[PDB]
Amino acid sequence: PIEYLLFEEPTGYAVFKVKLQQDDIGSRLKEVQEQINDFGAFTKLIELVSFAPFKGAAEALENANDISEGLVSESLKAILDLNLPKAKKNITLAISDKNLGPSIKEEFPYVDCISNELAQDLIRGVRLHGEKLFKGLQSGDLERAQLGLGHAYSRAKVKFSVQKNDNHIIQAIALLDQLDKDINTFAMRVKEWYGWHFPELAKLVPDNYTFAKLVLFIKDKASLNDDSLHDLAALLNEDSGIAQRVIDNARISMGQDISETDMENVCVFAQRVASLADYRRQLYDYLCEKMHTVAPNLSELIGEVIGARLISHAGSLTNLSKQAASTVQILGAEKALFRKNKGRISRYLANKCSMASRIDNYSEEPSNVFGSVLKKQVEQRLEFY
Amino acid sequence: NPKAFPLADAALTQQILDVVQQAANLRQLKKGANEATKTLNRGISEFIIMAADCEPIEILLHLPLLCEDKNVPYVFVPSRVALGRACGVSRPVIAASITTNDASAIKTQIYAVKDKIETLL
Amino acid sequence: DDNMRREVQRDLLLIKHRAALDPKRHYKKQRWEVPERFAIGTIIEDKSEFYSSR
Amino acid sequence: SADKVDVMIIQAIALLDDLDKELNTYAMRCKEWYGWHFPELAKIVTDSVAYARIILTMGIRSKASETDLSEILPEEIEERVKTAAEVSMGTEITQTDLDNINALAEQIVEFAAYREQLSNYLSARMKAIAPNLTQLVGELVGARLIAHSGSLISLAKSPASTIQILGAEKALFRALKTKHDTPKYGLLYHASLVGQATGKNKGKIARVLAAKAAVSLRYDALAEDRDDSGDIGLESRAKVENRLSQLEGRDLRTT
Amino acid sequence: GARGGAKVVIEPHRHAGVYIARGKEDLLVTKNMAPGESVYGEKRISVEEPPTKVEYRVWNPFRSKLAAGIMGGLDELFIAPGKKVLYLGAASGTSVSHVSDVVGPEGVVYAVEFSHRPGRELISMAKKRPNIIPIIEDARHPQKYRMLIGMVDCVFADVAQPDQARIIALNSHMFLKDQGGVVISIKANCIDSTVDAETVFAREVQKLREERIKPLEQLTLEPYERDHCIVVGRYMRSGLK
RNA sequence: GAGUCCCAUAACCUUUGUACCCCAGAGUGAGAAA
RNA sequence: GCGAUGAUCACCCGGGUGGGUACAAAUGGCAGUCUGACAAGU
């Protein structure tokens, strides 16, 4: 007595019409089970009459939760209303879920829901062939929508959030040290290139970042004016006296003058080193802020940079928390993060560090109150030994 | 809802602690969160007892994640000072573990309480 | 590759006869004819295993 | 003359190889870090510079609906990233995060912008210090040959055979000691002419091209009054092409 | 034994998608989908291939029951490359991540878990592995997540509940294909602690036959686990005779 | 005539410079001080 | 005015040698730049 079948698909809802009804008494016979697998026989049983795709991803999740609780979304109300004929005698609808049945009946008094094994068997067929039954109707791809909906449905129940997230910390550290290496490497090259044109400056201004900025100014050593002397004197300070030495030594040096095109790169290349240092300063401050937000307790106890390195070593804040006190100590024992009486404080700090991580990881909005008192406790231990 | 969950009642807590004190006498009790973390890792823990009044609780909330993943029962007792007294040590204890031993003289009592915690969870 | 670098060849010959390397090991019985597809790899320890297994 | 120092060549090529590595790691870092927000991009768009430009045009998946990416990506690829945007698995990110990831992206395009500038500069230098060599082997391979020897003069004092196999000492010097056959391409394998050849002709062209390379190279290094025209290379290039056409024209199979 | 820098010979296992790393000791290893990281701190093997650096993960039998099944010599596993697998009782990525490795990028895994504390970790691992669909929902009610699961070539159930026989049946009826695989891990203490282990295994097998699952094989997991057995069966809707 | 394709753009060893170490590791688990 | 939120657990004359861990450099070592007259067509 089944006449219509309702199927819920991540793309949308599909309604079918059952042309022929399969044998009830022989339902367990091998033959009636085999026809479910064969597509040639199955098409004779059911046909697609309607398909209403969801408007968007957000709609799919709303119906995914509504279907989970056995509630009838506005979309499902529409498709059934459009299809099911008005009906002494009631149109029969096959649904997978028994919990969904009463909800449909309240909305539509004239439809009877069936979810017995006969209905379950047809649903098994529809799920089995999937897009093949849609006769080319646009269901997108049933697998990609399934994947996207699954993460959406799951995280909604768990209440996953970005505030808890600490992967941002891990990425910044791997980038911060990489910036530090690259700034040094290129800054070294800037010294060599401008070293050829005027080697004595690389001795005068050892600080590379100072050297790069000064090279942007004194492109050609031949240019020497008292006004320029003041301008380069403004760069850094004359306490070292480099302002006077460069003016004097530029007048008198063995530096070999290089081409304008090569000069053009020393300033351009020095500019790139300047930008990276500017970016590295920005990224370091971003890391500092994020630790205070993510792991205020760990960051306050040891420091923003050190704690982030400890988090990266464990691979995640959660991994750090689950570890025992002994394991955390050897976690930073390769870079001496925590460093006989010297060893005792290292071990003592390790236990407190492990305690700090637990508070950060399992609190939705960690505060820094416990981290400070934890640190003062270490300070008293520090004074004692 | 509360982070410390589930919390054993007065009737159960006295039964739990009575097992704790005997396990201490038989050298089958591990005391402290760090010890309890090791036992779960080694898979030698019968079940974990925790203190619900730990200040803050968060310093022992890594155990439930370990306890469930290994399918080891766990329970909260209201008092840490009382739990420490049961353990046989002179300081409060926030977490304890009952080591696994099928040859223990107190096997039946451990299994009796272990059933109650499973139902309570 | 058909080159069959002698360093690789000696490695596999040192695994066919691994029972005699150490007098306290005494592995199971097996033949291990050289497979036609294999690769050589280096283990990477966990950072937590710095003292134990590194 | 300031325009005839080879030490700029050896540093320029050394810097270029360093840049190709660092630009790669930064491109990689952006792919995981921004891929957190939207992991499906890396599979769709593979080019690093293109990937960075997507972040620049649209900061967040929400912008994918209205933001137009046509200049970066073709039509069929560009709609894919729109479809992935609505169904994606990634987490939303704060503006503080976006500014930092956005800053990293600008470094990617900036380095690519500067990398091509360095390549052009090396081309100008190679065309001014050894113009004949560039006409024959090419600027990029030409620079590496100079850098391997350490100086233009030292390469000039090397015979043609060494220049053929300059970049394959390990294979060569392994082969000599063990009484096996020796390599035949070395560093010149990336020369344009050798690429045009096929089969065993690659080895023959490598021999012919290397011999002419030494002639064009020696005229570059030891000529007191060299004109920056490359005429010796250009006529040398014609001979190699003629040898190539005749060498390729022959067919082993019987007709 | 298997220290850091030691070199090993990687060769294929009899089961597709599983590899053996020989040496002084033998290790069961699966190819890593997300190279460069370990999900539960296992040892990893790095191989240079033309050159790209592939990475392998060590499979620890004492942590994953399925791995203990391989070591004891299960004849048939329906988990193979390019097959959809429904993993019930996915506490975390300890064993699902390895199952995700075997199926390959082409296959998929639907990880089903109930408790939320491990679920958050299951989602986190899932993002690194695109072919894992995490379902944080009770496996006793397969209908709640029917939208999220298509047909699955095999069903693997590690759920530790007394009524697991009902869980396996309901999920198999909805999602498992005809002639599809069923693999179940049974812990006798969990089902019935009063009676001995063998009766529970004998009792549990009977329920599967009632539920139209033909048991092909049972294996005990000692010495890795005590009181455990893995039963591999085929879902024969047509007839078990 | 002749192995680019086991990164000579490299690996390994030695020397120097810098910064740390001379305790156990799945570390142990109820003592310490008087 | 303690503690399971964790107690306890190489050499030589204040100075110098020995050994270990991370990085950088070396115009320091391994370390030595292939053969040499034929070939292709009718």
DSSP symbol at C20? G
Tokens 């071990």 correspond to A347
Distance D180 CA to F3 C1' (A): 8
A154 CB near a chain B CB, below 8 Å?
Answer: no
Mutation for testing the B interface, residue in A358, A360, A367 having most B CBs under 10 Å = A358
Tokens 């200040």 correspond to B55
Assess contact for A30 and A60: CB atoms under 8 A.
no
Instruction: Spell out the CATH class of B1-121.
Output: alpha beta
Shortest CA gap A279–chain D (Å): 7
CA distances from E209 to A26, E203, E218, E236 (A): 20, 10, 13, 10
Cis peptide before B56 (omega within 30 of 0): yes
**Is E157 strand, coil or helix?**
strand
Test E151 with A37 for CB contact under 8 angstroms.
no
Q: At what angle do helices A167-197 and D95-129 cross, to 10 degrees?
A: 30
Distance E52 CA to F15 C1' (A): 35
Contacts of A92 (CB under 8 A, 6+ apart): A1, A2, A3, A4, A111, A112, A114
**CA dihedral sign of residues C17, C19, C20, C22:** positive
Distance D135 CA to G37 C1' (A): 29
**Separation between Cα atoms, residue E225 and residue E219, nearest integer Å:** 12
**Separation between Cα atoms, residue E26 and residue E69, nearest integer Å:** 16
D39 CB near a chain E CB, below 8 Å?
Answer: yes
Strand order in the sheet with E152-157: E132-136, E109-113, E85-88, E152-157, E176-187, E228-235, E213-220
Chain-centroid distance, C-alpha D189:
13
**CA dihedral sign of residues A197, A202, A205, A209:** positive
Strand order in the sheet with A12-18: A46-53, A12-18, A4-8, A91-94, A111-114
Tokens 């329920």 correspond to E207
Test D15 with A189 for CB contact under 8 angstroms.
yes
Nucleotides of F under 7 A from a protein CB: 1-10, 20-31
| DSSP per position, chain B | --SS-SB--HHHHHHHHHHHHHHHHTT-EEESHHHHHHHHHHT-EEEEEEETT-SSGGGGTHHHHHHHHTT--EEEES-HHHHHHHHTSSS--SEEEEE--TT-TTHHHHHHHHHHHHHH-
E37: its two tokens: 């990281």
**Separation between Cα atoms, residue E208 and residue D53, nearest integer Å:** 57
**Contact B/E (≥3 CB pairs under 8 Å):** yes
D100: its two tokens: 């930092």
Assess contact for E155 and E175: CB atoms under 8 A.
yes
Assess contact for E113 and E90: CB atoms under 8 A.
yes
Would the Cβ of B115 be found within 7 angstroms of any atom in strand G? no
Test A64 with E148 for CB contact under 8 angstroms.
yes
Would the Cβ of A336 be found within 7 angstroms of any atom in strand F? yes
**Separation between Cα atoms, residue D57 and residue D54, nearest integer Å:** 5
Q: Give kind and range of the element (H or E) at residue A45.
A: helix A39-45
Of how many residues is chain E composed?
241
Solved using: cryo-EM
CB atoms within 10 A of CB D224: 4
Find, among E226, E224, E232, E111, the residue nearest to E180 by Cα: E232
Assess contact for E62 and E46: CB atoms under 8 A.
no
Please report, for chain D, how many H helices and E strands are present, in that order: 13, 0
Q: Give kind and range of the element (H or E) at residue A342.
A: helix A341-361
A125: its two tokens: 């067929």
**Separation between Cα atoms, residue B26 and residue B35, nearest integer Å:** 17
D228: its two tokens: 């920056």
Assess contact for A239 and A224: CB atoms under 8 A.
no
**Separation between Cα atoms, residue A112 and residue A94, nearest integer Å:** 9
**CA dihedral sign of residues D114, D120, D123, D129:** negative
Shortest CA gap A321–chain B (Å): 7
**Separation between Cα atoms, residue A313 and residue D176, nearest integer Å:** 47
**Which residues does residue E230 pair with via DSSP β-bridges, in sequence order?**
E185, E219
Burial, A373: exposed, middle or buried (Cβ in 10 Å; 0-12, 13-18, 19+)?
Answer: exposed
Burial, E144: exposed, middle or buried (Cβ in 10 Å; 0-12, 13-18, 19+)?
Answer: buried
Nucleotides of G under 7 A from a protein CB: 3-9, 21-22, 27, 31-36, 40-41
CB atoms within 10 A of CB D71: 8
C47 CB near a chain A CB, below 8 Å?
Answer: yes
Distance E22 CA to F22 C1' (A): 37
Strands E44-49 and E52-58: antiparallel
**Separation between Cα atoms, residue D147 and residue D139, nearest integer Å:** 12
The dihedral formed by the CA atoms of A323, A324, A327 and A333, expressed in degrees to the nearest 10: 100
CA distances from A234 to A38, A46, A210, A243 (A): 86, 86, 12, 9
